[PDB]
């Protein structure tokens, strides 16, 4: 009523239960989370929740978080994540800022946000074990090391392929296994790309988002993705428009105005970098 | 030298009963220069929980004087201590009374305090240990005004042995704001000392984690940390003495627990008040050393 008991899921799947005041902004919670994580470079990160459509909407860090989860969320549970994916993961200097980046990049592979082939998913899990588990005292059946995809006997074949590239990476520091793990996902397609459903100027449904180069429009019907030179970005009614002048349409006026913020946000983040 | 061998000497002193002998020979207060005339004033009697637990005049926290408090008095001691060059900055005070909540927040502001370490519940056994000087979440009174300061309670996360509360403090005259982290230990029993040593160690770790978080933003000294208990002496001294010795263990350094405690009592009387509290420091240091 006058306070919200919210649960923030860290990237390592741990939970922190925050009793939140009505006036408390989302930035204050993100700064509180950075304190517990020993995290210093809090600029690359933010928080997000499942909205009424189960769509990952990042919170408004400058607006109070208590009202956002009441009005636009299923349950009062936000998730910690990376809102600003850097082109160069070498840019990240502080140690703990890199580990949280490593957790987010690993979660993007294991859950399928960044699609990887069979072989890429194999080589990735090798560097993960040397950092998640370490240089073995001797263990892989324990936790999940592969994306969604499986056949029982292909699982046995790949797990031994990881269990042999496990010894080749021996004696190296886990912080360096995390770096080499990132700077391979760093270079993949779909890396750090967030898609939002929308319709085209012909009514054909598509997926729109802001990539590092610029606004990317990929088409569900298979049409070649265009990557927009942009004079500015604007939003009108249920539409969202760029100027050079093109416009897309979304579900409702809430969804489109939301996208304008992140695009100009990512546009501001990239022009500083 | 070894962490496991430093542990044995502490365990041996505990087992052989030496910690009981060395505690009793430490003096409770200053032999000379122990005058607390400012605290012992009639006008200031209303400002002390216990009339026998007072700060020394040369180390008392010294509020900017006003007309209601002509002496700018608050029952709080400055605790600055050095071992082999490592310096330590503390402010130890009693739990605020109702009439000293304004004086408490005046000190938190004037001394630039950003972290408060509360080692006690508001009430224990029906006796008041500290008045509720910060607003409560969940109610409609989420904001209080003491003097020229308007404190708001902004979030609260609860760990089993401790509770972290984030406060925003606003100077109504200047408009300045300051985030203040309120760390409250809640596992200390009403009678005796805590049994969960590992949980009390976590409370001291959270203090350092908040200390590191707040210092990364302040480029130009770092403010002292405010420990307070009922009288700001016994459980207050346990936190201060423990955190000092743990650093001496961290940066390998000879440990002389009675020498440090005797130095602490030269700045605030009765720091570490009971024998139980003293042996608790020995047990906490031992448990910390058995980290792995
Ligand atoms: Cl006390």
Residue numbers in the entry:
A (entry chain B): 20 to 157, 163 to 173, 176 to 254, 258 to 273, 279 to 307
B (entry chain A): 878 to 1097, 1100 to 1171
Task: Provide passages from the article that reported this PDB entry.
To help crystallize the FERM-PTP complex, we generated a mini PTPN21, replacing the disordered region between the two domains with a flexible linker. After adjusting the linker length, we managed to crystalize the FERM-PTPC1108S complex and determined its structure at 3.0 Å. The mini PTPN21 structure showed that the FERM F1 lobe binds to the α3 and β5 regions of PTP and buries an area around 886 Å2. The interaction interface can be further divided into three parts. In the top part, highly conserved residues from FERM α1 region (R59, E57, R55, and Q54) interact with residues from PTP α3 (R1089, S1086, and E1083) through hydrogen bonds and electrostatic interactions. In the middle, FERM β2 forms an antiparallel β sheet with β5 from PTP, which is stabilized by main-chain hydrogen bonding and side-chain hydrophobic interactions. In the lower part, R1031 from PTP β5 is sandwiched between E42 and E47 from the FERM domain, and E42 also forms a hydrogen bond with N1019. Mutation of critical interface residues in either PTP (R1031A and R1089A) or FERM (E47A and E57A) abolished FERM-PTP association. Several mutations found in patients with cancer [E42K, R59Q, and R1089H, from The Cancer Genome Atlas (TCGA) and Catalogue Of Somatic Mutations In Cancer (COSMIC) databases] are located in the FERM-PTP interface.
PTPN21 belongs to the four-point-one, ezrin, radixin, moesin (FERM) domain–containing protein tyrosine phosphatases (PTP) and plays important roles in cytoskeleton-associated cellular processes like cell adhesion, motility, and cargo transport. Because of the presence of a WPE loop instead of a WPD loop in the phosphatase domain, it is often considered to lack phosphatase activity. However, many of PTPN21’s biological functions require its catalytic activity. Combined with biochemical analysis, we have found that PTPN21 PTP is weakly active and is autoinhibited by association with its FERM domain.
